[PDB]
Amino acid sequence: VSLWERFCAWITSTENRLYIGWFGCLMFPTLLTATSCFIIAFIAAPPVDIDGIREPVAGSLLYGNNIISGAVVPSSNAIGMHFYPIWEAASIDEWLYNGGPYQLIVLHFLLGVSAYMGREWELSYRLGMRPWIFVAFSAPVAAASAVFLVYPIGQGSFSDGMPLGISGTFNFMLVFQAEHNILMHPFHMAGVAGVFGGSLFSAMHGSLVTSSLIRETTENESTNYGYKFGQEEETYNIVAAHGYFGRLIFQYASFNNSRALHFFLALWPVVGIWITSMGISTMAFNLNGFNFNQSVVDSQGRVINTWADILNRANLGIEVMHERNAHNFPLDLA
């Protein structure tokens, strides 16, 4: 009867086209502002002093870029970790010079993605679902907050944060290799196993369902039209695909349970990306990966090279060349 109850009834209605919910009250204003500023800053945005040395790095399309090289540049080294909104900038020209829109996009992104995650919970509550799709979405939220939030914190500047682009991503990955040795760190190892394993069990499960489909169509029409939507009959012989994989490797390595099978597809990647995103986090605070340089010596004591020493000389090439003007002192403490 009241105005608030007629508003709570609408905002929590599943009869809307897109469910809004109470998290959409701060998902939609956040992500539309992260979007509408991203499209403008990617297309039309002046160059940005990223190294704090007043050498402005172009990143937008109107200043001679493309899809690959164009990128929303991170904020300045001069700012660093300080909060830099528009009203604390004394003009928009001073805001866009010092890496303004990187903080406006990222902070409205991480609020909107952490609200998109809670929105996946909310609709599962109002639909009668068991709730935990949003726990599986915690794994890219852990990884998005690792390279945009946690790594600028432990390194003390948003300038070490990830550039919102495509070539800026590979500037981020290579400089992160030289300074932290991520490939030898066992948490990037535990998530390469998460996505190689994840793409394995995806294409391994998706093939054994498509292999054991039941005849419901003719050879002229499509294979997919043998599934009517909302039917109650099972659309594939699960005993058939169990007997196949029960002979392809051996018998006891096969899940006859389809529920425990469809749980292992959700376990393996998500655990692999939780562990990986806490690799960037523990390497944000300079707890680097393994270092086996000069580890094998002869009885005389001369250093015998290994593959890690060849990997070290690739890291030394990126270390002596990243931010080639920003350094003045012999050790990259930042």
């Binding site: 086209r17 499209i39 297309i43 399309l61 109107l62 001679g64 870029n65 493309n66 899809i67 939507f229 909302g230």
Partner: peptide, 30 residues
């Protein structure tokens, strides 16, 4: 002149995302 093509590819991609969400073929039981 060159960046005009890149912008048209990007907003043209966001058009077909708009039509796929709202003008989707709504699936129906029976």
């Amino acid at each position: 002149m060159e960046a005009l093509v890149y912008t048209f590819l990007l907003i043209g991609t966001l058009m077909v995302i708009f039509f796929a969400v709202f003008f989707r073929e709504t699936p129906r039981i029976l």
